[PDB]
A paper describes a structure:
There are five TBCs, termed A–E. TBCB and E bind α-tubulin whilst A and D interact with β-tubulin, to deliver each tubulin subunit into a super-complex comprising the α/β-tubulin heterodimer and cofactors D and E. TBCC is involved in the final stage activation of GTP hydrolysis by β-tubulin, promoting release of the α/β-tubulin heterodimer from the super-complex protein assembly that can then proceed to polymerization. This TBCC cofactor is a polypeptide of about 340 amino acids, located in the centrosome and predicted to form three distinct domains.
Two polypeptides constitute the asymmetric unit and in each there are two segments, residues 155–157 and 326–355, which could not be modeled due to disorder. The structure of the LmTBCC-C domain matches to the human retinitis pigmentosa 2 (RP2) protein with an r.m.s.d. of 2.3 Å and a sequence identity of about 25% over 139 residues. A comparison of the structures is instructive such that we are able to identify, with some confidence, the β-helix A face on LmTBCC-C as the region for interaction with GTP and by implication β-tubulin.
Author numbering: 158 to 325
The structure:
Amino acid sequence: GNVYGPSTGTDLFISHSKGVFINGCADCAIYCLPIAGSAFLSNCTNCRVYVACHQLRLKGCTNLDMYVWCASTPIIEECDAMRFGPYRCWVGLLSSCTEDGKTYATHAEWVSRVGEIEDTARTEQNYVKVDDFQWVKKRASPHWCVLAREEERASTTVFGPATLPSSS
């Protein structure tokens, strides 16, 4: 369970692990190698985040663009101005490597082999459905939406060096 942040204005590189917690980051891009477990973000604002994971939960976040490959539906809580896109927008992952130097040619391979999500076909599109569970009114939640094609930020950024966790 690696803990990262708080941090402002510096791009973060989160290596593969079985769980991450990201607290109090602002005004940056966050590039995560696939996490074979849950990712929890709290109190983050104005960040662009690229993450693959088994579960994704966000609390107290505002103006996050989330590029996500998740085995389950992402959950938000006390969040607003959230926009969701696919992990494949991190084009630079494909020119990156694992800690052991392994490289894969597609995002599905990365997510299957490093993320340990076996059913890549069924999960890729989980980012279009978000569970804003405290919004119990009948109408769609106004707190999140899906990024339009032209608003996708297709990052060519290569991973590394890994950001050192604050704790574990």
